[PDB]
Design a protein around this ligand. Sequence first.
Ligand SMILES: Cc1noc2c1-c1ccccc1C(c1ccc(Cl)cc1)=N[C@H]2CC(N)=O
Length: 127
Amino acid sequence: STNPPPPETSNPNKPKRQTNQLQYLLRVVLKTLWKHQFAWPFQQPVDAVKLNLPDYYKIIKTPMDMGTIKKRLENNYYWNAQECIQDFNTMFTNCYIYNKPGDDIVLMAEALEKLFLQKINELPTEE
Ligand SMILES: Cc1noc2c1-c1ccccc1C(c1ccc(Cl)cc1)=N[C@H]2CC(N)=O
């Protein structure tokens, strides 16, 4: 039983920019969420082998995690903030698909998502 290869965190043939929104997304949004007591399960790809979740990557075909997003930000992988926000959304959606309402992992995701939305409600001037 193996995990899949993780998502790419660089790609020279994908357009990219440094923008004020993307800088904020790393410096403020990601960095703040990272320090939350409920960040830890979302700080790396799901290790389905270690966690003994053999069906995880049968159900979840578009993995995404904050460790990946951090790397993407640091490497200027994104063209715009919206692309990074989409990744965060995929992370949350995955968690809500694989688990169920009331699970502890879902309480963790819901708290992170609430905080995320608060942080992103106001960004720097778009570019
Ligand atoms: C992300 C993600 N989505 O699902 C899971 C994770 C996850 C990642 C790393 C460590 C643990 C997990 C947890 C989990 C469960 C309880 C608590 Cl308190 C904390 C985390 N759950 C699995 C699914 C599972 N059913 O085990």
